[PDB]
Structure 1
Amino acid sequence: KQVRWCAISDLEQKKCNDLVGSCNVPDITLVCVLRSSTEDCMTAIKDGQADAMFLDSGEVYEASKDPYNLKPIIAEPYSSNRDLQKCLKERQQALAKKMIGHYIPQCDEKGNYQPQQCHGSTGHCWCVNAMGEKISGTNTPPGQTRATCERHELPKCLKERQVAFVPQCDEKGNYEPQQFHGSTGYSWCVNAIGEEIAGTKTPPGKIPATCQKHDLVTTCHYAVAMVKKSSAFQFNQLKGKRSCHSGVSKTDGWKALVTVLVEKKLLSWDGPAKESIQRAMSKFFSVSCIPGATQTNLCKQCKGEEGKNCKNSHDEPYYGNYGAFRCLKEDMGDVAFLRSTALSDEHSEVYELLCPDNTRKPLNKYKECNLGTVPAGTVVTRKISDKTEDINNFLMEAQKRQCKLFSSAHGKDLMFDDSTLQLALLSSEVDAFLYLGVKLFHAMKALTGDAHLPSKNKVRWCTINKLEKMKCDDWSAVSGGAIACTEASCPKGCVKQILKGEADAVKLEVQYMYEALMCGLLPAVEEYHNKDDFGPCKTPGSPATDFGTLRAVALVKKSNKDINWNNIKGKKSCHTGVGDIAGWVIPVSLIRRQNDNSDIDSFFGESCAPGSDTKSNLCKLCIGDPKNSAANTKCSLSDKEAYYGNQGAFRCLVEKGDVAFVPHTVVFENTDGKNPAVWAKNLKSEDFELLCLDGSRAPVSNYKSCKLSGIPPPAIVTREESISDVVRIVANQQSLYGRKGFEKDMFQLFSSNKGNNLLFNDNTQCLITFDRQPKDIMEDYFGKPYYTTVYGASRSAMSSELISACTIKHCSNSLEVL
């Protein structure tokens, strides 16, 4: 009902009051809280006296910590080569606007951009590629011969596959980061355009270099050092010069410059623990204007009145990008560190750029003469996010109603960056780490001074609940300094902690591994579940005959002799639950591949898959709890469904089903005397069979050959630099606390009085070191069958915020490079 925005200056106050008067969003009232600086506004948000503000991407990390504890919620989205159904989304967004006479993207029946796009109110038409980018020079005015638009849509990777080394592409057609040559066994990494990355080509039999995912994005901004043409100094002569900065906490005015200085060995500075960066910079420059600095010389050149001088606020006339440009223009500084947005063609006569390679270049070369790319700012609020919904509603309705959000006659870059075109809601999962990305996050953590000093002799294990925390505390108090404990809410949180340098290793089931291997983490060890052979456990050199891995199979009755694998469309199938590997993922994947129609909701008959839609076919014949007529629990992902779990999926084939997708164990687990005292009382394993992939059948004990696929074992993973350490400690900690450990009377790794299946599955026999084989790391963990079956041997089969945080954003002018 109310949204309080925090303004840092009188000009932001004036613009905010203008928006209060003019912008009329229903059921939401805008209120303007005035503070004197950026930090004061962050504190006001932390105190609850304000609700939202806009921060430079450099301030997000320090915003996420004490004494602020803020999270980004609303950011400007960037166009990339990963956008799917872009035309439909842009057309919907344009139609949602409350205006008349604006470009509404015209799509075709399939949702693709029409080659010719027109603006009805103006009559101007132009040609456009598959991503909606105007072909240069094709804009035709009304009454003029339109440019004949071709269909520029063929991806460059698929164009290289034709006319043919045959590179691999994904389903959309983009370049796979890992490239494997078939004629010559070579593995290498490629850019977002297939351009080979230097230093990644590996001969065969050698382990391949881990390739990172790349996303080609457009309209990037950069941190640049503007300098007047009348001056003559270069970059390594910055010491003693007078400087203007946009802000002490902005990336375009401080952080990027500090990084470049320390990398070029230009800044005399020990470390963030030995000396603050402001001291080194105050000793580096003579007199400067750096709004927010706590050194007198770094504020001598600022032009703010008493009380307003050197504040992170437009009250200081030299604050911001345009403030730094004004400080340079009025000869109060020799160089101005700002963003590429402040550049203009009206300045290409007096000013020029200052490149870190000790050369000078015109402004138009900012893409090849800068201190680094600067991500867009973000609207942040409290980490508790009590007002995110209201702030988002207000901002979205203000954007739909064409309110003057990103412009003002009072000044530039007030409230938001004037270069901002559109604000979008970020996933509630996104914090500072996910927003900035792993590499930028670690850079900020190192610059602030929070960089964790690694210990090669202590492993920080991550727990996902309180019972695992108690077992880890036991293990740590008994380990003798070799084991420490960190807490997270879920395994993906543990992966994020490991990527943030806050944890060291974690056990992940297979359903979490694709993300982990995507973010660079490698399997340190694999769980060994072979209950019959302790060979590899007693002596690590012993070869693993079988890891005790579960084999997904399709169990059928010996009575039904028509159920074949080529005859699984229809019938009545059985699933252990939605999400489970053997009872859902493997069959759904095999079916979606072999049947190109690929609609499971209509593929089976009255299938029972707990977790689907209660009205769909995948929820019939699921008798939900026999003796509880006071509630309806059919198709529940819990024990309240008598069809959930392996036992329920087997009871499905017993009672009303024709085929049940289960691990191979259930057949022996609910049969042959070793079976419950109810429905499976006189059932025999000889009355059942398995469905093989070639369309035949076989006895149950043939699960190693007549299987749908194999399930990889749970993997304890860590960062690469830590593998040699982690394994080591693990090995030692097994010899003391394994199943045959020397001190097994003091602690067991695979058991606990605090619970069951904590840290590791209690059925785990031991932990076997991962044998890094010279192939694709996902091909080496999942294995070719599982990799191609679930993820199609593709680095693009899944998308999430964490994968986006581990993706390198390759800047480019446009996607026309195809």
Structure 2
Amino acid sequence: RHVQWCTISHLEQKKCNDLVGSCNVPDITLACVYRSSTENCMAAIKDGQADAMFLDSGDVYKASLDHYNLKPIIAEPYSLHRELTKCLKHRQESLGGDKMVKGRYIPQCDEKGNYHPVQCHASTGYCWCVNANGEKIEGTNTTPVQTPPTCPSQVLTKCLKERQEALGGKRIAIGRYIPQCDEQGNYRPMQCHGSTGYCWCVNAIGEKIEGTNTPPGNTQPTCQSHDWDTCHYAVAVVKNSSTFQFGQLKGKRSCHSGLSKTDGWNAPVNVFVEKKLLPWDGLAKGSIERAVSKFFSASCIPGATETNLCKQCIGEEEKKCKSSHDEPYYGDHGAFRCLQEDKGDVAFLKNTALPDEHSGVYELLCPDNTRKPLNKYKECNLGKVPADAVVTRKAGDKTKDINDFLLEAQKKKCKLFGSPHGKDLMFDDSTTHLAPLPSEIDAFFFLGVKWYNAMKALTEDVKLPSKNKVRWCTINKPEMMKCKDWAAVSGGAIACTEASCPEHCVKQILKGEADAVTLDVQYMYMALMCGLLPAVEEYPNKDDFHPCQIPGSTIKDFGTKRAVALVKKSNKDIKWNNLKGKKSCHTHVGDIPGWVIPAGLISNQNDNIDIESFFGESCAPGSDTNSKLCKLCIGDPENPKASTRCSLSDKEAYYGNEGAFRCLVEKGDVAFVPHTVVFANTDGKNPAEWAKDLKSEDFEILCLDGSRAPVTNYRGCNLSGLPPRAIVTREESVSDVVRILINQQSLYGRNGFEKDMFQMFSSAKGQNLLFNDETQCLIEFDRQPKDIMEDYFGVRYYTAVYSASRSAVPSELIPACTFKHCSNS
């Protein structure tokens, strides 16, 4: 296997060439491909001439556009603020679950708040080993009959690991730095070198604070404790021999890391525009670069075309002003060098390129027109900037090879992150670890919506869409056509977009491409984790139309289904707590009332043991035919050769709500179904023979507390009620979407004033297009002061299906859409 790294300069090619020699990764061979600039490497990766390079966040954005179609795959992790430990968060969530779901696992945390490596389930006596994330090591379950397993100690903290590694087996790495750790195992804020006498500050994860390095014999530095803000900061660095302030920059000479860099271009320019130091607001006044050419007298801005913006660079011949180290003033350290050599009056870079030493001739130019010392960048800066990232082709044909190589090179301690030949070659010299990004991340989710739009805003006038119009997202062609019919009558309040599926609609809404979509329950966990909110919900209750006629009035019964455990009045010995091994009937695999809710509760109370093994003989269409979940099934439509048992079809006699009812009455101890199935097929409501004369009073429903009740009390004796379907949108668009939909509904709902013009809740083009056809009306979501998960799902459903946890991953989009960002206010 090979990885071809694209380099942008001779220095970097030489360093990459050194790694080809010095770094030995079995099975994966590195190679180095030279191009003359960041942009020529981007094109090489797009063409397959190379596979990977490291890019500044600004170029990550540029590379994500159709010209190059690259995506970020690997980056250094960062932190915004101190967080609860996972174990303590987990305890809090599980303890907040529905107390009526008894016997749930509550994690055991240690005196540092981490997971004990041995975890146990009180009500079942099972124990198992966990990793530091609290995830079970599969295959370590031991039963109460046995003693608790022996589990490897948890991995050490970075500091204690780095301490042990620095000791490297010996009694002391004599003459070498050994980190000093606190009791929680984080880095002490002040670190000192035990041989040179130098001291400096680090943040809680051990990154050095620039401007704090102090030689022995000087007053100790002042170090902040509990510093978990590890985002990088754009800064303007000046010499203390000058005296102008930030607002007096017009006409000065400047050094920038580069035209396409966030710290060298986007962050300063954004501030120039907000302060009105640049006469410029939109693409009507020209290009940003041209306006910047009028602002400064002479600069070095690698990659610029305007002449005075290259005037201060010092690259030889065609190398002058290239986005490449062949230009000595390129990049963070190049712009600092340009200040240091007095080609500029100010350099624009980020805190990680500031001098380490406290004492010296440099300080920061704050945008509030004061100056502050190097180590105050957190209060003297031009904004946090995004992380930088390794990129490859969107297709991801080499992603695994690139990740594997960098993981092994780092394990082996290869010299990735420094070099004799120069600074920031291949990777930033400040980098300490590169980790894989979420598999579905793209530039939008990596940079985050604020920096993504801010960088877009410099390249084109972004016309923000009207708050008086809802762009509805459709998932198939008939929906799109119903939506074009709505738009035609809507007077412009409705417009349409198209996507392949509900999750891509969620993505469009996150990215500002659509405004609203109706979601099945099964997509709501993903949509709420990504940060959308219910705006209105589908009210399905055919009996009481009062909530629709007089909106706002309190709702007696929302009308959603209730999942119940149905058994015969005869079978008196079956309770909830003894269903194990019995014979059960399920509408079909994947049904929420017939399967998801039952499977969730069983997993919750039996250590995630397969619902397949929990029951003896059961019928659940959609399972394997040789499995015990199909043995009770029959099929026999026309009693044909291919009776299609467990068929997910009406060819299976036991499929669906009625079908699960048959399976119970004929050969079953329990059926999992909506609370309506029994009534719908007893009291002779079903003319068929098996249901004829069945009567409702002959059955009852199991309650979670072991008791029972008659089928009529499904509201107080159910496995869980389902929440209604919801129309979701962005938080800041909820009020608009509510306002527009409730107006549309006054015209085109079931009692709409113009319901002859258009009907929201039906169509000739197909069934349940945009909304479910049985919707009575849409009702504004009355947001409560609680976790939205519990607010939207209801506590019972939340804990039964998701263990009342924010950590389930039913869609691979969740890690990408919850990725945290380095954004400003």
Q: TM-score under structure 1 normalisation?
A: 0.77
Residue of structure 1 in register with 2:61 after alignment: 61
The question of whether the paired residues in 2 share the 8 Å contact of 1:465 and 1:489 is answered with yes
Residue of structure 1 in register with 2:39 after alignment: 39
Residue of structure 1 in register with 2:239 after alignment: 228
Write out per-residue CA displacement over residues 33-64 of structure 1, whole angstroms, 9 at most, x where no aligned residue.
33222122222333333332221122222322
Give 1:653 deviation, angstroms. Answer: 3.4
Closer/same/farther in 2, CA of residues 644 and 3 from structure 1, 3 Å limit = farther
The question of whether the paired residues in 2 share the 8 Å contact of 1:463 and 1:487 is answered with yes
Amino acid of the residue matched to residue 695 of structure 1?
Answer: G
Q: Which of 170, 184, 197 is the aligned partner of 1:122? A: 170
Amino acid of the residue matched to residue 239 of structure 1?
Answer: K
Match of 1:316, SS?
A: coil
Write out per-residue CA displacement over residues 116-168 of structure 1, whole angstroms, 9 at most, x where no aligned residue.
763452335988679753456899999xxxxxxxxx9xxxxxxxxxxxxxxxx
Give the share of equivalent positions with the same residue, in percent. 70
The question of whether the paired residues in 2 share the 8 Å contact of 1:348 and 1:363 is answered with no
Match of 1:701, SS?
A: helix
Are 2:615 and 1:605 equivalent residues in the alignment? yes
Closer/same/farther in 2, CA of residues 613 and 305 from structure 1, 3 Å limit = farther
Match of 1:298, SS?
A: coil
Q: Distance in 2 between matches of 1:139 and 1:575?
A: 66
**Aligned 1:732-751 pairs, distance under 5 A:** 732-741=743-752, 744=755, 747-751=758-762
Q: Distance in 2 between matches of 1:641 and 1:19?
A: 63
Are 2:390 and 1:342 equivalent residues in the alignment? no
Match of 2:281, SS?
A: coil
Closer/same/farther in 2, CA of residues 67 and 632 from structure 1, 3 Å limit = farther
Residue of structure 2 in register with 1:9 after alignment: 9
The question of whether the paired residues in 1 share the 8 Å contact of 2:61 and 2:452 is answered with yes
Once structures 1 and 2 are overlaid, which stretch shifts more, 521-530 or 320-329? 521-530
Give 1:390 deviation, angstroms. Answer: 3.2
Residue of structure 2 in register with 1:564 after alignment: 575
Give 1:775 deviation, angstroms. Answer: 5.8
Residue of structure 2 in register with 1:146 after alignment: none
**Aligned 1:664-675 pairs, distance under 5 A:** 664-671=675-682, 675=686
Residue of structure 1 in register with 2:99 after alignment: none
Residue of structure 1 in register with 2:518 after alignment: 507
Q: Which of 445, 451, 456 is the aligned partner of 2:467? A: 456
Residue of structure 1 in register with 2:534 after alignment: 523
Once structures 1 and 2 are overlaid, which stretch shifts more, 447-456 or 415-424? 447-456
Q: Distance in 2 between matches of 1:126 and 1:372?
A: 30
**Aligned 1:90-239 pairs, distance under 5 A:** 109=152, 111=154, 113=156, 118-119=164-165, 120-124=168-172, 132-134=185-187, 217=228, 219-239=230-250
Q: Distance in 2 between matches of 1:326 and 1:257?
A: 18
Give 1:700 deviation, angstroms. Answer: 1.8
Amino acid of the residue matched to residue 343 of structure 2?
Answer: M
Residue of structure 2 in register with 1:367 after alignment: 378
Closer/same/farther in 2, CA of residues 430 and 632 from structure 1, 3 Å limit = farther
Give 1:333 deviation, angstroms. Answer: 0.4
Closer/same/farther in 2, CA of residues 66 and 808 from structure 1, 3 Å limit = closer
Once structures 1 and 2 are overlaid, which stretch shifts more, 546-555 or 263-272? 263-272
Closer/same/farther in 2, CA of residues 127 and 29 from structure 1, 3 Å limit = closer
Are 2:50 and 1:50 equivalent residues in the alignment? yes
Give 1:455 deviation, angstroms. Answer: 0.8
Once structures 1 and 2 are overlaid, which stretch shifts more, 118-127 or 269-278? 118-127
Write out per-residue CA displacement over residues 623-650 of structure 1, whole angstroms, 9 at most, x where no aligned residue.
5977999999998989898776545554
Residue of structure 1 in register with 2:544 after alignment: 533
Match of 2:19, SS?
A: helix
CA-atom RMSD in angstroms:
4.2
Give 1:288 deviation, angstroms. Answer: 0.8
**Aligned 1:603-752 pairs, distance under 5 A:** 604-606=614-616, 619=629, 621=631, 623=633, 646=657, 649-654=660-665, 657-671=668-682, 675=686, 684-741=695-752, 744=755, 747-752=758-763
Are 2:18 and 1:18 equivalent residues in the alignment? yes
Give 1:495 deviation, angstroms. Answer: 2.3
Match of 1:367, SS?
A: helix
Give 1:258 deviation, angstroms. Answer: 2.2
Amino acid of the residue matched to residue 296 of structure 1?
Answer: T
Match of 1:11, SS?
A: helix
Are 2:564 and 1:553 equivalent residues in the alignment? yes
The question of whether the paired residues in 2 share the 8 Å contact of 1:633 and 1:640 is answered with yes
Residue of structure 1 in register with 2:499 after alignment: 488
Q: Distance in 1 between matches of 2:581 and 2:498?
A: 46
Give 1:327 deviation, angstroms. Answer: 0.7
Once structures 1 and 2 are overlaid, which stretch shifts more, 668-677 or 68-77? 668-677
Q: Distance in 2 between matches of 1:626 and 1:6?
A: 64
Closer/same/farther in 2, CA of residues 353 and 522 from structure 1, 3 Å limit = same
Amino acid of the residue matched to residue 59 of structure 2?
Answer: E
Residue of structure 2 in register with 1:96 after alignment: none
Q: Distance in 2 between matches of 1:723 and 1:613?
A: 41
Give 1:740 deviation, angstroms. Answer: 4.3
Q: Distance in 2 between matches of 1:140 and 1:592?
A: 52
Once structures 1 and 2 are overlaid, which stretch shifts more, 380-389 or 132-141? 132-141
Q: Distance in 2 between matches of 1:552 and 1:274?
A: 62
Give 1:313 deviation, angstroms. Answer: 1.3
Q: Distance in 2 between matches of 1:252 and 1:231?
A: 22
**Aligned 1:207-606 pairs, distance under 5 A:** 217=228, 219-272=230-283, 274-346=285-357, 348-449=359-460, 451-538=462-549, 540=551, 544-576=555-587, 580-587=591-598, 590=601, 595=605, 599=609, 604-606=614-616
Give 1:260 deviation, angstroms. Answer: 2.8
Residue of structure 2 in register with 1:77 after alignment: 77
Q: Distance in 2 between matches of 1:409 and 1:609?
A: 69
Q: Distance in 2 between matches of 1:619 and 1:42?
A: 53
Amino acid of the residue matched to residue 123 of structure 1?
Answer: R
Give 1:683 deviation, angstroms. Answer: 5.1
Closer/same/farther in 2, CA of residues 126 and 658 from structure 1, 3 Å limit = farther
Give 1:515 deviation, angstroms. Answer: 4.5
The question of whether the paired residues in 2 share the 8 Å contact of 1:6 and 1:34 is answered with yes
**Which stretches in structure 1 are left out of the alignment for 5+ residues?**
92-106, 143-151, 153-214, 812-818
Closer/same/farther in 2, CA of residues 56 and 629 from structure 1, 3 Å limit = farther
Amino acid of the residue matched to residue 270 of structure 1?
Answer: D
Q: Distance in 2 between matches of 1:541 and 1:330?
A: 70
Give 1:514 deviation, angstroms. Answer: 4.0
Q: TM-score under structure 2 normalisation?
A: 0.77
Give 1:301 deviation, angstroms. Answer: 0.8
Give 1:741 deviation, angstroms. Answer: 4.1
Write out per-residue CA displacement over residues 312-355 of structure 1, whole angstroms, 9 at most, x where no aligned residue.
11121111111111111110101111122222335741222222
The question of whether the paired residues in 2 share the 8 Å contact of 1:472 and 1:485 is answered with yes
